[PDB]
Design a protein around this nucleic acid. Structure first.
Ligand SMILES: [N+]
Length: 172
DNA sequence: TACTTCCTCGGTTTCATCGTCCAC
DNA sequence: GTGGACGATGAAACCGAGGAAGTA
């Protein structure tokens, strides 16, 4: 019936946002709500379709090695292939998500950071469906400080697989 | 067939932002 | 008055259930 939303593997143009989502099918992990093997992994949103394709390629390389099926040949990812080896799978996926277009929108380049009225300072906020709160994390003089606060709250309320503005290792 | 792998996009959650409260 | 602390709102991200697309 319908033509595929993207010419690339693992890329779906979202019907409402118009963003190119990268996603991945983990055929080895176990879906526990179902019985069967298989889990959908969301890699992020990208304003550029080619960027979502590259994101899929890199995540697939981290999951299945240099001859899994790729939108582009593994020779184009040689450098990334080495860097990939130095981190967890979760660390690498968090990094891929951190570079994505949808990670942070608006004025600040950091997620959870926006500006306190017109005071020239930066508020950090974080969302928590438990308690139905948009928690306030303070006002800071630099975006990096606000982003640090957002990060700390993020690791606290999301633990592992928490995507932070700055590297998870900064907070050990 | 039946069965696995992959895509889609609607609920759900969270952010970006701006404007409002109240304890000082 | 007022200014941190937040709440309201709309935009936009997140993400799996489910159906579509390949297998074999
Ligand atoms: N967007």
């Amino acid at each position: 019936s319908t033509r595929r939303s993207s010419i690339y593997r693992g890329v779906t143009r979202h019907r409402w946002t118009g963003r190119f989502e990268a996603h991945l099918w983990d055929k080895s992990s176990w879906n526990s709500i179902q019985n069967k093997k298989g889990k959908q992994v969301y890699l992020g949103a990208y304003d550029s379709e080619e960027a979502a394709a590259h994101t899929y390629d890199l995540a697939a390389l981290k999951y299945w090695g240099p001859d899994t099926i790729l939108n582009f040949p593994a020779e184009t990812y040689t450098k990334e292939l080495e860097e990939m080896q130095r981190v967890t799978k979760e660390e690498y996926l968090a990094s891929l998500r951190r570079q994505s277009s949808g990670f942070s929108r608006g004025v600040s380049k950091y997620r959870g950071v926006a500006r306190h009225h017109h005071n020239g300072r930066w508020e950090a906020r974080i969302g928590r469906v438990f308690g139905n709160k948009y928690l306030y994390l303070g006002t800071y003089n630099t975006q990096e400080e606000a982003a640090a606060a957002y990060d700390m709250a993020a690791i606290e309320y999301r633990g592992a697989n928490a995507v932070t503005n700055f590297d998870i290792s900064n907070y050990i």
